[PDB]
Amino acid sequence: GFTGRKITSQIFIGPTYYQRLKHMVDDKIHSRARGPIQILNRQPMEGR
DNA sequence: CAAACACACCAAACACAAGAGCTAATTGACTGGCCGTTATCGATGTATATATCTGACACGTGCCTGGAGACTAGGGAGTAATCCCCTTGGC
């Protein structure tokens, strides 16, 4: 794609049926900096 | 015979079962006794609405008193003539 030179090996390309799972990235990314604390033991909370 | 320890067996518990990471949803106490507030039922009225009886005013009927009508009886009031007493009038 970049230079326009043929690829020495012959790639294997064709139609094929692909799915998409629900595991998006934005639903898993998480971070913390001195968030809310628990009431029993004064430690950070659990769960995104 | 009684006491020491050892062994095999039976009976009784302890603690562990990798690192974690994300998401969802089921549970949101309940009869009863009792006090405290408040809603309701009840009496004890006084105020207002209506019914009965009494009093004053009004229209109407009435009993009673006095007044009025037609008719009568018979005599009181009243013309027409007369006398002559007496008054007005006179010198």
From TrEMBL:
Compartment annotation: Nucleus
Domain of life: Eukaryota
Family of the protein in this entry: Belongs to the RNA polymerase beta chain family.
Role: RNA-dependent RNA polymerase that catalyzes the extension of a non-coding RNA (ncRNA) at the 3'-end using the four ribonucleoside triphosphates as substrates. An internal ncRNA sequence near the 3'-end serves as a template in a single-round Pol II-mediated RNA polymerization reaction. May decrease the stability of ncRNAs that repress Pol II-mediated gene transcription.
Protein name: DNA-directed RNA polymerase subunit beta
Range of the intact protein held here: 1108 to 1155 of 1251
